[PDB]
Design a protein around this nucleic acid. Structure first.
Ligand code: FES
Ligand SMILES: [K+]
Ligand SMILES: [K+]
Ligand SMILES: [K+]
Ligand SMILES: [K+]
Ligand SMILES: [Mg+2]
Ligand SMILES: [Mg+2]
Ligand SMILES: [Mg+2]
Ligand SMILES: [Mg+2]
Ligand SMILES: [Mg+2]
Ligand SMILES: [Mg+2]
Ligand SMILES: [Mg+2]
Ligand SMILES: [Mg+2]
Ligand SMILES: [Mg+2]
Ligand SMILES: [Mg+2]
Ligand SMILES: [Mg+2]
Ligand SMILES: [Mg+2]
Ligand SMILES: [Mg+2]
Lengths: 295, 110, 86, 168
RNA sequence: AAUAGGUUUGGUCCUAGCCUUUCUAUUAGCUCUUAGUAAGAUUACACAUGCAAGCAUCCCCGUUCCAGUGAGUUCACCCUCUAAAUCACCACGAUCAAAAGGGACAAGCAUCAAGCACGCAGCAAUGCAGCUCAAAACGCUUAGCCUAGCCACACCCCCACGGGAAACAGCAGU
């Protein structure tokens, strides 16, 4: 009938790609790593514009958003219960199929318990076993302590939210429960402290917006976009909100009033926005400065 | 198509015709000098069966490996005389030439 | 500096040197602009531009001179005659 | 400095920049070129610059050169089937000659990508052994597993010196 | 040889050798507390003693492996062909891998420069006179190697019918 869009829909990706932004100085910040002497090229104005164009293409790849997946369902499947083996071993065996050309989500990893039960390994055992035999750069078999609540607040205090997300992406699978819990705790610390600019021009901005829109908490991000003269993004945010909440007070108000452009933010501010007053004020200020520039 | 001979197709220059029905052919290959990283010619001798004794010293011949060697040192047969000594036919035009000059102009037969 | 006494030679050399100062261009005030390979008489000097943090990996005298110029990161190799004045 | 003109030709980096990897059919490549003449210049630069790259990527293909034997330069390839491929190169630049023989007798980028992938199957990450062949030599290098006794002494209970002492 | 340094001269510059500084291994001197781990005759010289191959309803199979050594030394690698062996027996096959054939494969000495039959054709008879080599043949000397390991040897006469002779280069040990 009428399906609500997914994160990977072309309409949603285009909206979130623009709201993210592309800043080549931030996207290609100098990395603190082993250095080599730089190379130099003599370029015309045309050769320079082409090299800058190629950098933009390489940046749009580096800003490719990771897909937002729902939590994986625990694996509880018993393959066999050989009770004659009960009490013959004290420690359980983990068997991992290490055939090279198999996707890691198709690899049979089974566990023989001391009771004699042959069961499929749990999601946590699977990701641990895949790391043992197919070690991925940046991932640890034992969970790093940085992801403890006390240590994430340290990283948040330093405004290192992007490092937290880079570490979480490298350690956990996108559908893991630890992967989702860390991202959600990071998005919430950004909303509470108004640190939405820390994720602009990164592949993590869209996932953050997706979280706010689905949880009906876009008031903070919408104010930040207006204070920065990003009304195009602020208007797209209100439109993305209506697309994902079609049967809502704000979506109807826009239909009844045929609102467009800045008018959408006014409709949203009155009906559904929690900080409706602070938006009108923040929006009023913007229209004034725009009139001063016009005059 | 299978053969016990290692070198299946090789080009070389005939350097001897004193053996009956056998041409002695010098084959050169490029070999990389590991230290200098420069290629130098490395030459090897192959005996080739020439049933019709049509090979002349100095002509470039193409050798084909035999299924099995017919003699201690004869592992190849004459497959084609590429460049007859002093009687080269230009493959690009098909006309006879003497060095870098045509003996018959390509314009003769249009 | 030349003199019969060592302390007088020190005075002459150092006081004269300030009247024969070179200006040395530095890339980002830490290294040279490009690799420099030259021969002076029989002394060969090959210098390489280096990134920050590389340090001065050069003949001890080149290290001393580079600190006076203000070069922080460079590699240099001295070949041929190793004469301090050359 | 390195002897000769264009010493870059005598570097492994230069030699590995050849893009012509002949199909298995190619057994012999003869080059007939002329030392002088403006129309044979590309063939001379091809011999000077690219023959080394072709041989480097095709070590088992015989390459033989012939000077001033004919009025115009040409390449001829001898294939295992017995077929011969004549390539006229007069008036062509060395870069066009390299692109021509790549098209008609060179392996495409797909065929080469596949071969590289099959080579990776030979070094399985899960296999343990010497560093020359494997990432890790022993399971003790995996965090969470019992470490090597050379670094962390084992508990007295996991050592045979004391298992026998108590038992005996 | 490097980021180099010391040393030729009455002095300077250049060239040049030697040595210094760095990192390992063995041995010697002097000295030395514990725990874990790795490694562990100088000698292809001679060996006391003990042990190191049995299994199994008799047949067979195994003792041809493992373990050892480094004397000798381009038998190790690739291709072709094809045995034995494994897949219960057959696989017109797969795996594994001999012999044979082709190719490849250490160092030093050229005051080792010639080798001396080292080639080819033919069904055969036999005919031709060639074959290798300064792009290093032939020769002498040195050395186990390219180390997931491999090659060679197994008291000596390369071999082992035979002979000399009575064997730890299996472990421990002298
Ligand atoms: S090397 Fe792994 S236990 Fe010692
Ligand atoms: K010296
Ligand atoms: K000792
Ligand atoms: K040896
Ligand atoms: K022997
Ligand atoms: Mg002197
Ligand atoms: Mg004097
Ligand atoms: Mg000692
Ligand atoms: Mg053995
Ligand atoms: Mg010895
Ligand atoms: Mg068989
Ligand atoms: Mg064999
Ligand atoms: Mg052989
Ligand atoms: Mg003498
Ligand atoms: Mg020896
Ligand atoms: Mg003995
Ligand atoms: Mg013997
Ligand atoms: Mg012993």
């Amino acid at each position: 009938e009428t399906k609500k869009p997914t994160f990977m829909d072309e309409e949603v990706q285009s909206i979130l790609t623009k709201m993210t932004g592309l800043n080549l100085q931030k996207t290609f910040k100098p990395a603190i790593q082993e250095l080599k002497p730089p190379t130099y090229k003599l370029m015309t104005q045309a050769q320079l514009e082409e090299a800058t164009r190629q950098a933009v293409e390489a940046a749009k790849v580096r800003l490719k958003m990771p897909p937002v997946l729902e939590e994986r369902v625990p694996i509880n499947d018993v393959l066999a219960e050989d009770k004659i083996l009960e009490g013959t071993e004290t420690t359980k065996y983990v068997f991992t199929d290490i055939s090279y050309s198999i996707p890691h989500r198709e690899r049979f990893i089974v566990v023989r318990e001391p009771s004699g039960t042959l069961r499929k390994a749990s999601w946590e055992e699977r990701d641990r076993m895949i790391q043992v035999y197919f070690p991925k750069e940046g991932r640890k078999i034992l969970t790093p302590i940085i992801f403890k609540e006390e240590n994430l607040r340290t990283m948040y205090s330093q405004d290192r939210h992007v490092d937290v997300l880079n570490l979480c992406f490298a350690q956990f699978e996108p559908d893991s429960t630890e992967y989702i819990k860390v991202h959600h705790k990071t998005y919430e610390d950004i909303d509470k402290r108004g640190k939405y600019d820390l994720l602009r021009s990164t592949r993590y901005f869209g996932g953050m917006v997706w979280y706010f829109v689905n949880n009906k908490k876009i008031d903070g991000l919408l104010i930040d976009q207006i204070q920065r003269d990003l009304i195009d993004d602020a208007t797209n945010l209100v439109q993305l909100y209506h697309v994902l909440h079609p049967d809502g007070q704000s979506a109807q108000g826009a239909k009844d009033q045929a609102a467009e452009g800045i008018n959408l933010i006014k409709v949203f501010a009155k009906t559904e926005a929690q900080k409706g007053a602070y938006i009108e004020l923040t929006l009023q200020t913007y229209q004034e400065a725009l009139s001063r520039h016009s005059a | 198509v299978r053969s016990s001979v290692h070198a299946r197709w090789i080009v070389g220059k005939v350097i001897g015709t004193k053996m009956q029905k056998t041409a002695k052919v010098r084959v050169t290959r490029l070999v990389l000098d590991p230290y200098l990283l420069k290629y130098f010619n490395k030459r090897k001798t192959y005996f080739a069966h020439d049933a019709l004794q049509q090979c002349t010293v100095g002509d470039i011949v193409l050798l084909r490996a035999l299924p099995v060697p017919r003699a201690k040192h004869v592992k190849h047969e004459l497959a084609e005389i590429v460049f007859k000594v002093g009687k080269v036919i230009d493959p690009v035009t098909g006309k006879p030439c003497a060095g870098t000059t045509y003996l018959e102009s390509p314009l003769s037969s249009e | 500096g030349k003199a019969t006494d060592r302390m007088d030679a020190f005075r002459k050399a150092k006081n004269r040197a300030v009247h024969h100062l070179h200006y040395i261009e530095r890339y980002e005030d830490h290294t040279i602009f490009h690799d420099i390979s030259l021969r002076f008489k029989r002394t060969h000097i090959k210098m390489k531009k280096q990134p920050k943090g590389y340090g001065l990996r050069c003949h001890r005298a080149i290290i001393t001179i580079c600190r006076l110029i203000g070069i922080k990161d460079m590699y240099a190799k001295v070949s041929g005659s190793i004469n301090m004045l050359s | 400095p390195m002897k000769g003109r264009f010493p870059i030709r005598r570097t492994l980096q230069y030699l590995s920049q050849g893009n012509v990897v002949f199909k298995d059919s190619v057994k012999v490549m003869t080059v007939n070129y002329n030392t002088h003449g403006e129309l044979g210049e590309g063939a001379r630069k091809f011999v000077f610059f690219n023959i080394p790259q072709i041989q480097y990527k095709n070590p088992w293909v015989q390459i033989m050169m012939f000077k001033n034997m004919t009025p115009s330069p040409f390449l001829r390839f001898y294939l295992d089937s017995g077929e011969q491929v004549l390539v006229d190169v007069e008036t062509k630049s060395n870069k066009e000659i390299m692109e021509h023989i790549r098209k008609i007798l060179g392996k495409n980028e797909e065929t080469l990508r596949e071969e590289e992938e099959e080579k990776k199957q030979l070094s399985h990450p899960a296999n343990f052994g010497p560093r020359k062949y494997c990432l890790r030599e022993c399971i003790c290098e995996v965090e969470g597993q019992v470490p090597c006794p050379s670094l962390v002494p084992l508990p007295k209970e996991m050592r045979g010196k004391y298992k026998a002492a108590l038992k005996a």
